[PDB]
Structure formats: structure tokens, C-alpha cells
């Protein structure tokens, strides 16, 4: 009686929090939106997707989330966003499946306890918010793999700063779930403070 199951492409608020999904697979991968800012997924060779809760306007706040993060294949737990003006998308990779990403490597930022690996990629005439752009996407990976715990987001944008990464004005920003190719489940949750 109120958890709600969605499988089509769509962004909305559910329970008070921003949320997510989109698919270029309907029909392979789920999203259950649960109370406050949690939600699950459930994928079965999937094409590529991201899904998660957050805000509709992205910046600084310290967030803390808690996840049960189970890929069979590739599969990222992301603090994921995007800017516009520039044109960015952004990726604060807490755990990963089968790859860890990577990238053009720019320095390290340690932050909440862990140390990140910085990277920037590009994309060409590439999907975004925006419709096919050619953008700059903006990297932390963690060192070790975590499934909880506080990302201070102001850190990773001051540290992208410094290596000349330079982010426009926020859109979304989620916790996210992101797969390419594999099949799997998480629950995520995600707050403030």
C-alpha cells in the first residue's frame, strides 16, 4: 500500500526527494521508490542506466548515504549531477562492480576518511540533459571501495577547481545507482547533513 515501482524514463519528487531513472533499455531495470530519500533498483541484462534520490538543484551540502549495492557486471554507486553553463556531468564514485573508472588522472582529494582519485573525461556529440552535446565529465573514485558513509561535496568540487575542472550552474545532483551491460539490485538512501 505505497511504495511505487516505476520501469519508464522520468524525473518527478517522491516522498519529499528529487528522483532519477532513465533507461536505453525499458523493460530491463526497475527503480521502487521507498520513503524519504531511499530507493531500489533491480537490473537483468541491462543496457546502460542511472537511477537514484537527491535534489532537483545541486551544490556543496554534505550528504550522507547508506546503500546495499549488489552488481553482477559493471555498475557504479555515484554521487552523480550535472551543470549547464558549462555543460558538465560529475561523478563522486563511492563503489563499483566489475570496473573501476578512470580517466585523464588529475591529482588525488582525501576527504571523509578516504582518498579519491581526480580524473576528467570528455564526450562527443553524446547524450545529456541537454540532447547530443560534446561535455566534460568530472571524476572522484574512491581508493577503496565504501557502501556508506559522508561525502562533503564541497571538498571534490574544491579539489576539481584546483586542477582546472570547472563546474556551471546545478542542475540535479543523486545518489545513484549506474549500470552498463550487467544485471544486479541496490538500495540506496541518501540525506542531508
Avoid at 76 to 104: A, D, F, Q
Avoid at 138 to 149: A, P, Y
Wanted: aromatic fraction near 14%.
Amino acid at each position: 500500500g505505497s511504495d511505487t515501482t516505476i520501469t519508464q524514463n522520468q524525473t518527478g519528487y517522491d516522498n519529499g526527494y528529487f528522483y532519477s531513472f532513465r533507461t536505453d533499455a525499458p523493460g530491463t531495470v526497475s527503480m521502487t521508490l521507498h520513503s524519504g530519500g531511499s530507493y531500489s533498483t533491480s537490473w537483468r541484462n541491462t543496457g546502460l542506466f542511472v537511477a537514484g534520490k537527491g535534489w532537483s538543484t545541486g551544490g556543496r551540502r554534505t550528504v550522507t548515504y547508506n546503500a546495499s549495492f549488489n552488481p553482477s557486471g559493471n555498475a557504479r554507486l555515484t554521487l552523480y549531477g550535472w551543470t549547464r553553463n558549462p555543460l558538465v556531468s560529475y561523478h563522486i564514485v563511492e563503489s563499483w562492480g566489475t570496473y573501476r573508472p578512470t580517466g585523464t588522472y588529475k591529482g588525488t582529494v582525501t576527504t571523509d576518511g578516504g582518498t579519491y582519485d581526480i580524473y576528467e573525461t570528455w564526450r562527443y556529440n553524446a547524450p545529456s540533459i541537454e540532447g547530443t552535446r560534446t561535455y566534460q565529465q568530472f571524476w572522484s573514485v574512491r581508493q577503496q571501495k565504501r557502501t556508506s558513509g559522508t561525502i562533503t561535496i564541497g571538498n571534490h568540487f574544491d579539489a576539481w577547481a584546483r586542477a582546472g575542472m570547472n563546474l556551471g550552474s546545478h542542475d540535479y545532483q543523486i545518489m545513484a545507482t549506474e549500470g552498463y551491460q550487467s544485471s544486479g539490485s541496490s538500495t540506496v538512501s541518501i540525506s542531508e547533513g
